[PDB]
Point group: C2
Chain length 383, copies 2
């Protein structure tokens, strides 16, 4: 007799319902990504896997708008690639500065504290962005080696302007690391042209691939910082000197990269390349304008008061006065099979979040969620 | 749409349809997938906090508890493939200055030693030649000498083709106030393991060896003694995202939930759930039997064609990954290429200390069959006939 018996719960067939995911992530998968999902396995070091890896690197270079050879995939979902960036870039005692205008800057600060950096934060209210003047004041005061700036603040629905920030940092002998998890593919970014030194994103937002892999790129200035270190990064597996070899970034090793995740990412990148970035950005702007018109018509208010900093991909809507937000979210799910979310970090209990991400950024999906919200407002209990 | 012109053009290579050839994967991993797991790869997405996902997470925990044979409530999934979960184990278990003991008999012990050095541990290694295992006497002498807080022991040494006996090691460690961490990445599902009954305090494995489950997630479990070491830390572990004191709350491992962001690789979980369902349906005993039978059959073929085992003692030969000494006069790359080119079968060379010294043949779950053994045996006999020899 075995200690632990076969779980009865596993004897039932796996079933996943069909829903429209209009929250902050994960997004619905595009047909090409769906098709990729049941492809057979091949060996990690085989000719065809090496070709798929090179095509993925080219695709990431295209979406990021970078020529950086140190551009690759790391395991992990959401914003966890910040750990890969920080573990490599920061040594104990290094001065680090964050744009803490939501949960992401705060999280970067927490990680940097854990590895022994001297952590400094420019704290702003949720719903605000950073000006060049504010960042220059932070650089002057703290003299950081690295600035962390969030492009798409998915906890607050904020899009951060990127022009001029990289060169401002360079004037202070500081590198610029950008988080574009919630913005990449939906908002204009030109990594090399904007002087961004390190950037990461995820597969599950605009890219419409399954969660679990992240995209990261380091320029040679950033690689120079890593090679100047007194000590090896705390993580062997996310050490850029190991990852670079694995991904053939220096003219290759043994490793277990996630094969099926690579097939899906390859297809997601192919779809963006075929549409072209300009069309992808226009499509998100167009979907968001239509959503913002419906929200205004329903009398719902925006959490972000300045229209110019509203993130096209994820909109923060102030919870309507008198309602329980959980009833609105549950009503939309039960009656329309649409997933929307509440808040995150500083916006917990304060907002609804609606995401219009890649394949889902259509005026048709906007009409579906607008209808669902209208019905929720007339039927959910009010005070 | 923005303030600059696009200067990196779309890659033309991405416009070609994505296809992959049909091959039999008999290397050290990944293995070919069972039809249910393949099918689970194309399932639709759902939200991370939704009722259906929470239920899948619950069934996965139960499934891991079953394959590990543990009642530990702190049993969950972490991101990362291969043996990466050793980082999650070591970042949580070791503080700067902690004495750490490793069974360095292949690449995995060397890897644990490196990671432990990176985090400021006082690292002590019991170095043995590739192809050997640790005796209870050897481990006791290491424990006595170094007084480690943690011993790292590799169950399935996939770089050398060695299976480590586990009976008595946990109990021995506890007499020296030491925790036992076991790596079962290459052995789980194919070799008998009884986590609680063998006194294993921490164990990890991954989903792409015997489990046949993409995309490459890790399974990990900590008992109460291991939890106590983690909560007694004077400093936070280096990773927030793999901090077990936060991940335990997320996964509902203590009754007191706090939805700290962390992660959920959804398609990953679907495939893992199905793989765990297949193993539970078949039963662990039958799974272990299938591996022994397939390996026995492979070993009989190898003996008959004159190939020599890298592991001298037959009882220490890992059923799931067999190491074969490269035969004298041949270029091992020619053998591996011949098997691929003429039979569409993937086998491998060595790893770490067995690089250039061995061939590796894996029989991992779904692929651990008689027909597959017969196929690789024919491919190997023909490679020995037709590859150039000195
Ligand atoms: Cl979907
Ligand atoms: Cl397959
Ligand atoms: Mg409309």
């Amino acid at each position: 007799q075995l200690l632990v018996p076969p779980p009865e719960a596993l004897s039932k067939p796996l079933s996943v319902p069909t829903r429209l995911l209009l929250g902050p992530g994960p997004s619905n998968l595009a047909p090409r990504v769906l098709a990729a999902g049941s492809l057979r396995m091949i060996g990690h070091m085989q000719k065809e896997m090496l070709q798929i890896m090179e095509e993925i690197k080219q695709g990431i270079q295209y979406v990021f708008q970078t020529r950086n050879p140190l551009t690759l995939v790391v395991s992990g979902s959401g914003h966890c690639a910040m750990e890969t960036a920080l573990f490599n870039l920061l040594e104990p005692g290094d001065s680090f500065l964050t744009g803490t205008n939501g949960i992401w800057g705060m999280r970067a600060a927490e990680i940097a504290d854990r590895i022994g950096a001297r952590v400094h934060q420019m704290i702003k209210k949720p719903g605000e962005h950073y000006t060049l003047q504010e960042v220059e004041e932070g650089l002057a005061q703290h003299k950081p080696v690295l600035l962390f700036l969030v492009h798409g603040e998915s906890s607050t629905g904020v899009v951060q302007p990127l022009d001029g920030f990289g060169e401002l940092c360079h004037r202070y002998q500081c590198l610029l690391l950008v988080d574009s998890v919630a913005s990449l593919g939906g908002v204009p970014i030109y990594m090399d042209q904007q002087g961004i030194d390190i950037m990461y994103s995820s597969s599950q937002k605009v890219l419409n691939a399954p969660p679990g892999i992240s995209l990261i790129s380091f320029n040679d200035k950033a690689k120079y910082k890593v090679y100047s270190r007194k000590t090896k990064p705390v993580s062997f597996y996310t050490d850029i000197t190991y990852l670079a070899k694995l991904w053939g970034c220096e003219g290759v090793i043994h490793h277990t990269t996630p094969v099926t995740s690579l097939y899906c990412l390859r297809e997601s990148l192919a779809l963006i390349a075929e549409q072209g970035l300009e069309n992808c950005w226009r499509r998100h702007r167009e979907a968001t304008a239509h959503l913002h018109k419906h929200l205004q018509e329903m009398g719902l208010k925006f959490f972000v008061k300045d229209p110019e900093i509203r993130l096209p991909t994820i909109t923060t809507v102030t919870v309507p006065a008198g309602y329980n937000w959980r009833d609105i979210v549950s009503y939309v799910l039960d009656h329309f099979s649409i997933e929307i979310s509440g808040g995150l970090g500083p916006t917990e209990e304060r907002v609804l979040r609606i995401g219009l991400l890649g394949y889902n950024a259509t005026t048709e999906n906007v009409d579906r969620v607008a209808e669902a919200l209208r019905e929720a407002l007339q039927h959910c209990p009010k005070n």
